């Protein structure tokens, strides 16, 4: 029985001509913490969203995940992972033939079996996860994706592109690469990285865009400063910390092994 | 004591059986030769009979195991005979003519006779309680014998692939896919459909199979029925003294396992379930203490939701 997966050998298909969505559910479920009328600390939910993003065209879709979905619910974290599954389907269900993925790759395994019983109806779609360690739930910890989900009053699907205008002028591999570096920056510690990410004060993001809008020698900067955050937080983590093990290792880390 | 089973035991003779042959009845076995002519002071009741042939002539200490399942009874007297044709037991009964004169016998035959040693009785007894005549019945193959390696098959009731309802809406595959008390009915109803608890019956027969025929898809049925049990919240409401008998049943069969995951998962959604608030007093004291008897065992924290269960905790003012 063939158990095929996203690996460091075959990641060249994300770019390759077929249709692939990222499926992260990482973020649908999300509390905060909160006191009680009678002053005690717990926790309450707020609301989460999942994240489908396609690799090869950068297009996101943002399903926001409202609490009103969690109420009278019980074990919301198990049931999580089926509400995941049933969007991911009905969002396949209202895409034509042609625009269905032929690959669903989860960024958590617990999402496989609740994928394969809503998609039963789809049989020709692979449903795998992933060994690359892809940093996708960071995509909250961007101010504009955050608050929308924040404040939402109701379920919505709301549709992004994660490589802004970047498709003009550079492939969907580089495009990639800029972008999972931003987000592993992100998760690595959002201050340091979002400094970095406006290297001048009139350094400004369009209102249709995500990415701050910098000249070709700006990006090459602030991703060799995003690689330095990325690998002096490996190594403080692991406490072997030398510029020493980078032959394309470096590849290893910002993609997640 | 129990020198009353000198009297009052049932007594397994088989004739004609080759030197070698591996011959048992529940966990007990014995090497076969001219001396041995079966077993005697039997408790009665269902008993698990188990043999191997020669390997290939000369041992090579293997022989696939067969095993077929006898309703023994007080004072009875079994006689079986050995089929060179097909190196197996033949079950044809014998003739009455043959059995009179086999019990007028039993006097001069007790030196050929292994007692069943009744130390290893109460833990047969904590797997097969709950099967009966019945169980054996439905469940045991065509031709009787079970076989760890086509008439053997054992008769195990068809187990659903899909959990919910025909048309289930998302919704409705949800709910039926995380609660399978849908599914468990299903089956109940077409098996039992006046005794759901004949249930446990069958699961005890699937492990005996296993555990001692070596049947290992009869592993997978346990597997599969046990799963089918565990993750069926809403029947412990409606089938509360099965799920009781359950945990008793499970203790048993749990015991006999070393733990070498499919078990950690379906047993933390059934302590979930069975200990609860929701459910009678008398399920949840019992499940409280089964689920710490099972931690302290093999070192797992079965009250702990799944890890990837937990929510993002955000930072917000």
New interface residues.
Partial sequence: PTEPYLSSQNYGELFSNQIIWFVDD??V?????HKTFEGNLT?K??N?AIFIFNPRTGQLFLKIIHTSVWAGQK??????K??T??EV??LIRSLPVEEQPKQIIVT???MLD?LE??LLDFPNIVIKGSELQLPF?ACLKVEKFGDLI?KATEPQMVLFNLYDDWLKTISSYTAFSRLILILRALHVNNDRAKVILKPDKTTITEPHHIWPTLTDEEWIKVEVQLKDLILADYGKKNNVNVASLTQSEIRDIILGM | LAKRLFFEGATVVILNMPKGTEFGIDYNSWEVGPKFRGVKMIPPGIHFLHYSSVDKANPKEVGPRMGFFLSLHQRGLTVLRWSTLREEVDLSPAPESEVEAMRANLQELDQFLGPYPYATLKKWISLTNFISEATVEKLQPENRQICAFAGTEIRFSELPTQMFPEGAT??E??KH??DLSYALETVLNKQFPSSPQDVLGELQFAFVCFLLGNVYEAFEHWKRLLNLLCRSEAAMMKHHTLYINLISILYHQLGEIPADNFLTSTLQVFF?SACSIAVDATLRKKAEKFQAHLTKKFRWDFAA??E?????????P
């Fill in positions: 990482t973020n479920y999300r509390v905060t913490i926790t939910p707020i989460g074990r919301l974290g198990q049931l999580a089926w509400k599954a049933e389907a009905a958590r395994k617990g609740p019983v809503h739930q924040l | 998302p919704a595959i949800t896919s995380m979930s939701e799944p990837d269960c937990a929510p993002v905790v955000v930072e917000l």
